[model samples]
Target: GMKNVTKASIDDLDSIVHIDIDVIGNDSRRNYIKHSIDEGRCVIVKEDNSISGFLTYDTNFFDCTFLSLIIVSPTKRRRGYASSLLSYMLSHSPTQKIFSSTNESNESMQKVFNANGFIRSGIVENLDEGDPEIIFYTKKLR
Candidate 1:
């Protein structure tokens, strides 16, 4: 079955916020998600009419679109929802280039990025003290 991915709005904020808290182990992204929705830079994938996962992107890095967050609900992991979100974004990105990154500790996210055609681009150290941020890029998105 195919899941629907659409731009998120204020109505979907509660659902996305709940998932974020459970997945990220904190409510740090609450305000950020609100801002993303207002900017129309957030999207969510829904299953059974409920939000299964969501992602937020913006052209805030070197004028290139960057995926700042990709989170799937705690109960919805391993269902390919995150990958689907990335795929949708890649095809629909407004810019010629898009990038994403994750902490070196989050190997699963890194795997998803690689599987979706992103190549290791660069790294920024000291962002998380010990865990370096690994950047991935894909400009040939079709």
Candidate 2:
């Protein structure tokens, strides 16, 4: 299991900006990462007390909590950090259900969501040229 996972601080933002790639995908995503810090909706995963990954989220959109993105350092991929971030966020989410999506082509994230108990809910076409947006969700089961 990964260790020392927690929410990120604004101070970490500068470093997140330094040792990252797609973590700075575009203006919108960059803005979301900034928002994550301000709103306390981002989860940070650390390895040996240094940041290894992060998760950003939003709420009240489509009446459900939306987990926007999960980014793990390229050097630290495939170590269950994604799952730990999901579990941590779910524990703190204000909504009963949490939703997220990835390009259908992203097989790695598909595995991450599936392993985290987020079943495929549906799909949205045309989001990308070929790969559709694959939606995943988890609800409190009785």
Candidate 3:
């Protein structure tokens, strides 16, 4: 099958924001996504002509591309949507190395990261109460 993921533009910002709030249950990422789109670091997956999942990355983590967010609509879950977004990000990575982090409580996200070839790089405590943030990294050099 052809990859449905594509780079998001400023025009797609509205749909991405809507999907993020509807799926993630918050409007907190609205501005962040805008910034990502402005910087050309946003990619989105479309399903049935609608936005299903989206990913954003930036070269702010040790000068490596760091995935800032990945959001998949709940209605479109279990169809490898998140993994598809990750694959798009990896292939189009702005740098040789890519990094991402997820809360320890988010086991599903952790699984997606591992499935995308991201190795556990490190951990940071006190980020989410009892749930620590686990960092992962993958390099395309090899």
Estimate, for each residue in 1-142, the C-alpha lDDT of model 1 and write its tens digit. 4688989999999999999899878888899999999999999999887999999999989999999999988886455888889988878888989898999998888888988889999999979989999999997465
- Model 2 stretches astray by more than 4 angstroms: 22-28, 140-142
Tens digits of lDDT, candidate 2, 68-122: 8788877774568888888887687778889999999999999999988999999
Q: TM-scores across all candidates?
A: 0.93, 0.88, 0.92
**Can you tell me which runs of candidate 1 are displaced by over 4 Å?**
none
lDDT score at residue 132, model 2, on the 0-100 scale:
99
Q: Order candidates by TM-score, high to low.
A: 1, 3, 2
Model number with the top TM-score: 1
- Candidate 3 at 36: error in angstroms? 0.7
**Which candidate number would show the highest lDDT if scored against the true structure?**
1
Residue pairs with clashing backbones, model 1: none
